[PDB]
């Protein structure tokens, strides 16, 4: 086995085709299924894995009560083959209430953050053993992507943030080789708040589309030079911004150096990736809540902040159905690197009071050069009967 280099081109994306769906919540009404949130998908060279941050309990479990709390010492990184629901045999790969993972072509890197809010510890588990750890540098919720890291030529890059949830924070880009932190780069450029980055290999570098929880409804971009460890940051130009909350399409504006200051506070983990000057991006259909999910290409959306020309729209989750975090992951094809994305389908508290617990299902779509129709793939759990 040789390190991944992702040295193939990004082949044409005409849109996205259905790939996987865990149906976790529906199954949990009739089985022992983990309570989860912050899911993501990452693939070793042969097959894809679904990850999630468990709450240390199953849904049909007295402990599933009050699972809205996002940081407990019982949260662990769940790891299954993609499409295997988080059943009781699910391997907990580390203790974490925030995590990221990539496969470098030889082994799995898991970056796992747990411990006290203001005193968190990030453990770096590579090939099944703890190789390194770093303490919170800003002592305010050290946190990472909640999606796959990007691992090029055995050098793994993970974006980690520490500091104000909705103010200036200290973001660093760690470069990990076989679990060892060999270099740490401070966030550089014009991105003013960076959280929950959705990163993909863009050879020779790594590109991250992240969450600005402070001032932008446009998503910050972080470009990572894996060779010299240089960092540059910006925002997605697209006038059709991808964050939630955001202003309506008619009244929304973007700026690919600065946050747009349009309903900038709060946000959601999302993703975008460039296709020449265009941008493929997903976002909740609802502009203020995490309801529905859509993906589309914005013509010139990667370079022209005034561009609101949308095309290739696909509804992934109907606007009446609950979306959540979404993130990118990349899959090496025969001759090209495909872009795929997952959507967290959040159900339960606080929004849904029919149940006491907070969990999610996932739906996974992959870029296609072929053709596709239309549909909607929500969670589909009828919480009234649960």
């Amino acid at each position: 086995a040789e390190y991944r280099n992702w040295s193939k081109p990004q082949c044409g994306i005409t849109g996205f085709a259905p790939f996987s769906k865990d149906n976790s919540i529906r199954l949990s009404a009739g089985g022992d299924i983990w309570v989860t949130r912050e899911p993501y998908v990452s693939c070793d060279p042969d097959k894809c894995y679904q990850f999630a941050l468990g709450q240390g309990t199953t849904i049909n479990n007295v402990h599933s009560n009050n699972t809205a709390r996002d940081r407990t010492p019982h949260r662990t990184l769940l790891m299954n083959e993609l499409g295997v629901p988080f059943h009781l045999g699910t391997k907990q790969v580390c203790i974490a209430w925030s995590s990221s993972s990539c496969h470098d072509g030889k082994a799995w890197l898991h970056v796992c953050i747990t411990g006290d809010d203001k005193n968190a510890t990030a453990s770096f588990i590579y090939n099944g053993r703890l190789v390194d750890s770093v303490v919170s540098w800003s002592k305010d919720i050290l946190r990472t992507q909640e999606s796959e890291c990007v691992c090029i030529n055995g050098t793994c890059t993970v974006v980690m943030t520490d500091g104000n949830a909705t103010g200036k924070a200290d973001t660093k880009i760690l470069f990990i080789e076989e679990g060892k932190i060999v270099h740490t780069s401070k966030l550089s450029g014009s991105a003013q708040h960076v959280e929950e980055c959705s990163c993909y290999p863009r050879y020779p570098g790594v590109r991250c589309v992240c969450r600005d929880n402070w001032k932008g409804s446009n998503r910050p971009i972080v470009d990572i030079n894996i060779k010299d460890h240089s960092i540059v940051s910006s925002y997605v130009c697209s006038g059709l911004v991808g964050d939630t909350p955001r202003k309506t399409d008619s009244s929304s504006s973007s700026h690919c150096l600065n946050p747009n200051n349009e309903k900038g506070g709060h946000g959601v983990k999302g993703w975008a990736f460039d296709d020449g000057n265009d941008v493929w991006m997903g976002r909740t259909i609802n502009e203020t809540s995490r309801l529905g999910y859509e993906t589309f290409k914005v013509v010139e959306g990667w370079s022209n902040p005034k561009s609101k020309l949308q095309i290739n729209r696909q509804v992934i989750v109907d606007r009446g159905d609950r979306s959540g975090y979404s993130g990118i992951f990349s899959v090496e094809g025969k001759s090209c690197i495909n872009r795929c994305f997952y959507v967290e389908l959040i159900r339960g508290r606080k929004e849904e009071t029919e149940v006491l617990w907070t969990s999610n299902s996932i739906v996974v779509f992959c870029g296609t050069s072929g053709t596709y129709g239309t549909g909607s793939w929500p969670d589909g759990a009828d919480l009234n009967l649960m």
Partner: nanobody, 125 residues
């Protein structure tokens, strides 16, 4: 981080301006509270930007809390003093942003800091 209240003294049943100087940290970084002890009794709070305030009901319309983030100084303008207590200046414990300003408690990664730094307090009688 250290806070140092000042301006306390003997006031006739009149006005008195309390000052709180911050050293070792920038006042703009923190919600600032005034807490008096006659137990502990929250008096008023000043937002980080200095544009929003809340007051205890019994002091509303009498006490004015302000700050100068450039000077790292928090102020409590006390008027129509009836209020005898040791007045503490404390940082942290943001209110809920959903009520107009403060922390986004509904975000995925909510954070909270208590009143982790207090001044020694200035006596007002």
């Amino acid at each position: 981080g250290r806070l140092q209240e000042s301006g306390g003294g003997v006031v006739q049943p009149r006005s008195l301006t309390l000052s709180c100087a911050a050293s070792g940290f920038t006042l703009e970084t923190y919600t600032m509270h005034w807490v008096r002890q006659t137990g502990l009794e929250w008096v008023a709070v000043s937002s980080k930007d200095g544009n929003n305030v809340y007051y205890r009901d019994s002091v509303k319309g009498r006490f004015t809390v302000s700050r100068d983030n450039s000077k790292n100084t928090l102020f409590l303008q006390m008027n129509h003093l009836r209020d005898t207590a040791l007045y503490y200046c404390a940082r942290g414990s943001d209110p809920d942003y959903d009520k107009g300003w403060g922390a986004y408690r509904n975000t995925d990664r909510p954070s909270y800091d208590g009143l982790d730094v207090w001044g020694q307090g200035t006596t007002v009688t």
